[PDB]
C-alpha cells in the first residue's frame, strides 16, 4: 500500500513562497529517492529535482536551483518542496513521485497539489441546492463563484457514490469559477433518505454542507 499523500492546494502572491509536503507510507522511506514534477494547466510534465532520502542531497533542474529547496524529514517519512520568489508561470500542479529503487523511472506518483500564483483574491464558493420545482429524479448543488481551483464535492459524507456526477468548472470573465454536482436517484427515496452535498475549497479554507432534499 504505497501511498504518497500531498498537502492541500493553495493560492500564493507573486514573490511569496510555497511549501508542499508529500507523506510517504507503505514502504521503507530511505529505500527510494523522491522527485518533484510539475504540470502547468494544459501543458506537459516538467521535472524539478530529485532528493536522496538518506543524505538529503539533491539534484536540481538548473532552472529551479536558485529558488527551490527540497528536503526530507526522516522522522516522519515526508518529503518537502519549497519554491520561493513565486512567479505567475509557477501556477501548476506539483507532484511528488517516488523514484524506482536503483532505477531512474518514477514508479509511484502523488495526486498533486495545485498552486496558483496570482495577486487575485481567494473567494470561497456559495453553495446552492439544485432541484426540480414540480424513472429517475435529479438533485444537485451549484458551487458558485470561487477562486482559485480546485474544489472537491462529495454526497452524504462519502457514503453516496452511485449516480453521483460532479461536473467540471466553468471560468467566467469575472475571474471566478463555478461547478455543478448532481446525483440521480430513484424517486422512491424522497423524504426517507436525506441528500447533502459536501464542498471543500482548500485555497480559501471553506467547507460547506448543503442539505438539498429532506
Amino acid at each position: 500500500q504505497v501511498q504518497l499523500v500531498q498537502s492541500g492546494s493553495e493560492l500564493k502572491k507573486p514573490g511569496a513562497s510555497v511549501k508542499v509536503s508529500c507523506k510517504a507510507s507503505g514502504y521503507t522511506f530511505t529505500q527510494n529517492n523522491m522527485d518533484w514534477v510539475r504540470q502547468a494547466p494544459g501543458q506537459g510534465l516538467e521535472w524539478m529535482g530529485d532528493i536522496n532520502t538518506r543524505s538529503g542531497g539533491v539534484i536540481y533542474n538548473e532552472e529551479f536551483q536558485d529558488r527551490l529547496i527540497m528536503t526530507v524529514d526522516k522522522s516522519t517519512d515526508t518529503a518537502y518542496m519549497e519554491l520561493s520568489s513565486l512567479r505567475s508561470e509557477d501556477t501548476a500542479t506539483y507532484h511528488c513521485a517516488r523514484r524506482k529503487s536503483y532505477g531512474y523511472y518514477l514508479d509511484v506518483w502523488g495526486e498533486g497539489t495545485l498552486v496558483t500564483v496570482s495577486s487575485a483574491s481567494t473567494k470561497g464558493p456559495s453553495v446552492f441546492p439544485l432541484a426540480p420545482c414540480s424513472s429517475t429524479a435529479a438533485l444537485g448543488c451549484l458551487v458558485e463563484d470561487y477562486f482559485p481551483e480546485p474544489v472537491t464535492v462529495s454526497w452524504n459524507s462519502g457514503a453516496l457514490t452511485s449516480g453521483v456526477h460532479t461536473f467540471p468548472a466553468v471560468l467566467e470573465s469575472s475571474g471566478l469559477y463555478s461547478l455543478s454536482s448532481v446525483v440521480t436517484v430513484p424517486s422512491s427515496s424522497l423524504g426517507t433518505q436525506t441528500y447533502t452535498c459536501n464542498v471543500d475549497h482548500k485555497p480559501s479554507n471553506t467547507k460547506v454542507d448543503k442539505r438539498v432534499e429532506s
Binding site: P132, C133, G140, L142, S178
Partner: protein, 212 residues
C-alpha cells in the same frame, strides 16, 4: 540540454493499433520509460526500460527502442487508453528529461445520447438578487454538441457560460451550461428552455417560474 520529441496527437479506433514515437539523439543507447495520464488524473508508469511492463499493464501495450527512435504501441485499443502519454529518459548530464507528450484519443466508440437536466434558480439564489438556470448534459458520445438557450422560444444572446465538452471517468462527455438572468427577467417569461443538439438529434428541457 537533451531533447525528447513526441507527436502532438494520435487517434486510434477501438480494437485497433497505433504507435507513439519518442525521438532523441542516440536514444537507442538510453533506457526509455513511459507514463499515461488520464484526464484529471496523475500520471501512471506504463512501460519502463524500453519494453518492460509494470504491474497491471496488459500485454497489448508494447515498447521498443532503436537508433534515434523509441516507441510505445497500443494494440486492441480500449476506451480507457485515452489520455496523454509521456516518454522519459535519465541523462547523466541533463538528468530526468520528459518528452512533450502525445494526446491519444480513442475513436470508433458507440454513439451515446446525452442525458439533459435543467434546473431552475434556487430559492437561496433568488434572495441574493440573481437568477441562474443550470443545464447539465451527460453521458454523450461523440463530443460535438450545440447548446442553445431559449426564452419563450426566442434565442438568448447574453449570460451564457457553456463548458467545453470534456471527457469523464466513464469515457463519455459531459458539459454544463449556465444562464444568468435578472430576477425581473426570470419572472417576465412563461418558460425557459435548454436545447441540446447531438449527432442530428435535438432534446429540450423546459422550466416555468409559476411551477416554483
Amino acid at each position: 540540454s537533451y531533447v525528447l520529441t513526441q507527436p502532438v496527437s494520435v487517434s486510434v479506433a477501438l480494437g485497433q493499433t497505433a504507435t507513439i514515437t519518442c525521438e532523441g539523439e542516440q536514444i537507442g543507447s538510453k533506457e526509455v520509460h513511459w507514463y499515461h495520464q488520464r484526464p484529471g488524473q496523475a500520471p501512471i508508469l506504463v512501460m519502463f526500460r524500453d519494453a518492460r511492463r509494470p504491474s497491471g499493464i496488459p500485454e497489448r501495450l508494447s515498447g521498443s527502442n532503436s537508433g534515434n527512435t523509441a516507441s510505445l504501441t497500443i494494440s486492441g485499443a480500449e476506451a480507457g487508453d485515452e489520455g496523454d502519454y509521456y516518454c522519459q529518459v535519465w541523462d547523466s548530464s541533463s538528468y530526468t528529461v520528459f518528452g512533450g507528450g502525445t494526446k491519444v484519443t480513442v475513436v470508433g466508440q458507440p454513439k451515446a445520447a446525452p442525458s439533459v437536466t435543467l434546473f431552475p434558480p434556487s430559492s437561496e439564489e433568488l434572495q441574493a438578487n440573481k437568477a441562474k438556470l443550470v443545464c447539465l448534459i451527460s453521458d454523450f458520445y461523440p463530443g460535438a454538441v450545440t447548446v442553445a438557450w431559449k426564452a419563450d422560444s426566442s434565442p438568448v444572446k447574453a449570460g451564457v457560460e457553456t463548458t467545453t465538452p470534456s471527457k469523464q471517468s466513464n469515457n463519455k462527455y459531459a458539459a454544463s451550461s449556465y444562464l444568468k438572468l435578472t430576477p425581473e427577467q426570470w419572472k417576465s417569461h412563461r418558460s425557459y428552455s435548454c436545447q441540446v443538439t447531438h449527432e442530428g438529434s435535438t432534446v429540450e428541457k423546459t422550466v416555468a417560474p409559476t411551477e416554483c
